[PDB]
């Protein structure tokens, strides 16, 4: 699964929202979380991310596993 990571953070941003197969897009106020778990394995969302920072959650390094984990966590609760 693809997940976000840190820059993304910025306040209400708006693209990796009506682009996602399975909605699995989801706000922790100033940022939109992907649910890696819901995700697919599609790219659409990073390509649309005008920034290019959306990676698999393998993929994003160690540091930022950290979000995998939180991205993980946030919708299994
Ligand atoms: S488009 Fe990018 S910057 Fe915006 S919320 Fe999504 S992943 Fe984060
Ligand atoms: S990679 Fe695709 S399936 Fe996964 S969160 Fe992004 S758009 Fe949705």
């Given at each position: 699964?693809?997940?976000?990571?840190?820059?993304?953070?910025?306040?209400?941003?708006?693209?990796?929202?009506?682009?996602?197969?399975?909605?699995?897009?989801?706000?922790?106020?100033?940022?939109?979380?992907?649910?890696?778990?819901?995700?697919?394995?599609?790219?659409?969302?990073?390509?649309?991310?005008?920034?290019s920072?959306?990676?698999?959650?393998?993929?994003?390094?160690?540091?930022?596993?950290?979000?995998?984990?939180?991205?993980?966590?946030?919708?299994?609760?």
């Amino acid at each position: 699964a693809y997940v976000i990571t840190e820059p993304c953070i910025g306040t209400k941003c708006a693209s990796c929202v009506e682009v996602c197969p399975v909605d699995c897009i989801h706000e922790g106020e100033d940022q939109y979380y992907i649910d890696p778990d819901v995700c697919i394995d599609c790219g659409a969302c990073e390509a649309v991310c005008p920034v290019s920072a959306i990676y698999h959650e393998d993929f994003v390094p160690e540091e930022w596993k950290s979000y995998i984990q939180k991205n993980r966590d946030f919708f299994k609760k």
